[PDB]
């Protein structure tokens, strides 16, 4: 239904992550959640549809890109020790009060 | 808006009680959800509810819209082996910002 890639990674400070997304039911809503401890799920980019972006809640440090329907990406830049948590993608589905369906994640770590 | 569990995490004995706290703060009309995330997956959906006093159900899982005090506790009477992972209690924004707030949520640990 939504899946990432890639599943795991490590990443030294100062090197540039990019996170992918991709959904396969052609939802116009997708997001990217960072989950960490005490704070549970938090959205750093959403994608309201095709070509277009929006910040989340935490977007410093991030920057997303919505190409096409299908795909939603996150890149970090130049990574720092604080983005070390594990990041869900999302799909929103209209249909069910935007009920979401996530992707099985992307465990990363900054060295 | 913002979502409160006041539980971080829960240890019960299989078969025990179960009751997870979900207490929110919204600017309107929110549905309410509430996911669950099992060892190394994303979250999915169990169950929401739309209108208040209204009940959403799963899994023997369920949780009462209660507009007035704000809340929408997670319950299951009898708790099993495969229900320990963590809740998460969410209000989906569909009628407005369509953007879904999550709370920290709770890691539930069911020693047989």
């Known amino acids: 239904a939504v899946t990432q890639s890639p599943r795991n990674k490590v990443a030294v400070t100062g090197e540039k992550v990019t996170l992918s997304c991709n959904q396969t039911?052609?939802?116009?809503?997708m997001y990217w959640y960072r989950q960490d401890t005490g704070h549970g799920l938090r959205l750093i980019y959403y994608?309201?549809?095709?070509?277009?972006?929006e910040k989340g809640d935490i977007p410093d440090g991030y920057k997303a890109s919505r190409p096409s329907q299908e795909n939603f990406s996150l890149t970090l830049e130049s990574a720092t020790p604080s983005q070390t948590s594990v990041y869900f993608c999302a799909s929103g589905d209209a249909s069910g009060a935007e009920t979401l369906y996530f992707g099985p994640g992307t465990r990363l770590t900054v060295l | 808006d913002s979502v409160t569990q006041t539980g971080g995490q829960v240890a019960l004995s299989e078969e025990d009680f179960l009751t997870i706290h979900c207490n929110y703060s919204?600017?309107?009309?929110?549905?309410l959800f509430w996911y669950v995330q099992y060892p190394g997956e994303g979250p999915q959906f169990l169950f929401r509810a739309s209108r208040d006093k209204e009940k959403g159900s799963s899994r023997g899982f369920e949780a009462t819209y209660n507009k007035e005090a704000t809340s929408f506790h997670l319950q299951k009477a009898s708790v099993q082996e495969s229900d320990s992972a963590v809740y998460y209690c969410?209000?989906?924004?569909?009628?407005?910002?369509?953007?879904?707030?999550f709370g920290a949520g709770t890691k539930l640990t069911i020693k047989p």
């Open positions: 919204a600017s309107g009309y929110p549905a």
């Open positions: 039911n052609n939802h116009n809503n």
């Open positions: 969410a209000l989906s924004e569909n009628y407005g910002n369509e953007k879904i707030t």
């Open positions: 994608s309201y549809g095709a070509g277009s972006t």
